[PDB]
A paper describes a structure:
MukBEF folds the chromosome of Escherichia coli and related bacteria.
MukBEF is an obligate dimer, formed by two MukB2E2F monomers held together by their MDs and MukF N-terminal winged-helix domains (nWHDs). The DNA was captured directly at the open gate, while the proteins adopted a conformation virtually identical to the open-gate state. DNA-binding surfaces were largely contributed by MukE and MukF, and to a lesser extent by the root of the ν-MukB neck. Starting with the ATP- and DNA-bound capture state, we envision that upon ATP hydrolysis, the MukB subunits revert to their apo conformation. MukB is now free to sample the space around the DNA, and as its straightened neck is competent to bind the MD of MukF, the neck gate will eventually close. This results in an overall rotation of MukB that wraps MukF around the DNA and generates the holding state with DNA entrapped inside.
Numbering used by the authors:
A (entry chain C): 1 to 294
B (entry chain D): 1 to 147
Amino acid sequence: MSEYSQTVPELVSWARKNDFSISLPVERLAFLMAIAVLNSERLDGEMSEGELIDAFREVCKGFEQTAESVAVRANNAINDMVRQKLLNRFTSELADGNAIYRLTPLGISISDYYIRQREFSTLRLSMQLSIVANELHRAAEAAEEGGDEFHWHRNVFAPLKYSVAEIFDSIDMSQRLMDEQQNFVKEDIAALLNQDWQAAIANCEQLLSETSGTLRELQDTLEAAGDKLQANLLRIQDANMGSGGSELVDKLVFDLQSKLDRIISWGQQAIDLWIGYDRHVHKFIRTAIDMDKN
Amino acid sequence: MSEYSQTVPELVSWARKNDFSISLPVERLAFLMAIAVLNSERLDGEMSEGELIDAFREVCKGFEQTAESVAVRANNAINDMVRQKLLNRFTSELADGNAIYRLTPLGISISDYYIRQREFSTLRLSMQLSIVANELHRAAEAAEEGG
DNA sequence: AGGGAGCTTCCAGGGGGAAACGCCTGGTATCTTTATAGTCCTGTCGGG
């Protein structure tokens, strides 16, 4: 079953019928981030209503807002976050009516995008690739050992769906992070050339070389592991075809192979785009420096 | 270094200075989801400007909207998504000026929350604990080996 | 030991005083509506 069981028209009809939307102005986003920071400093991962109100007061202070109606504004903000599926509220009779709050997977993902300083680490990728290689190798050995529907579900499907797929998604996010980093560097090089292009030549060459080395090192690492990961996916596919198959395992393996191809292809494409820019900046600098001679 | 290097007041000041905000109306959110779906069906994880415009046209049809200025409306929506950090645009001289688009980690996280049907699994938890147990065991053996 | 009356102590009853609760009025926040003005597009025509 395609992760997205619905076609574009069906999804559009479904979204339209459920009236989904998200509204996080700077203050609300700051409050969410403050809640995320406060939750990370705690031992129980739970926040009371009073603690959330204190956090809202700090945001309001930070925005230099009137102390009038702050308890009301905090309640409206808390209700808005719950209504927007950012917070889960637990109302227990045992807690004398005091509600307990926890951030939802959505509220966490959003807050982390802004607060977590995510930079591309080669070590991280090498580690992730190591875990997926071991998980795929175990799943391939389990598929080759053969077994019943319970064995194929517990030792092959579960590791592919609940472990390998997650790791591949994490790698794809790391690539999308790298993509944002490249666009940021292009803006910095243009600024350096507008301030003092003569002194900026060494700094621009450093930024171009550091980015190029990183992209290449990454691609080298993906290519080295990619062949072993594909071989293990093929071993699982061959073992599945030999044991009468399972349409669920075949589709899952096909999806993982498609993601792996996307992950490998992205690196080469990013290198070509960076090379085009690098050549252009070098040509520009040479034209600016060397061709005027007086 | 705490994952969140900044205290709450510092973060609030930083957020205020950078002016970060999210506004996701039904139509734009539907367009984002349509883009996310279209990207998942592709082999290269890349979308051209014409393909994004075709996707917007389908959303507009699904919302029963006027076919007038759809190309403009689509450009406004695409620029809004890029301006909101949901899409990364690549403009290469080699591509004769044709821009290539990819969804940002943010645009993906948001689209997946709505489209991905997420339900809890013990098998998954058992596998995750097994992997972490092996990774922690190797790290402990490496720490005990010294170096 | 039983029965009644006196002294002494504690509870019951009265009276005051203010707060709290309940209700209304207006203010403050929030949101919507309405209008205006922009911005861009589209269309037409004419000219090149």
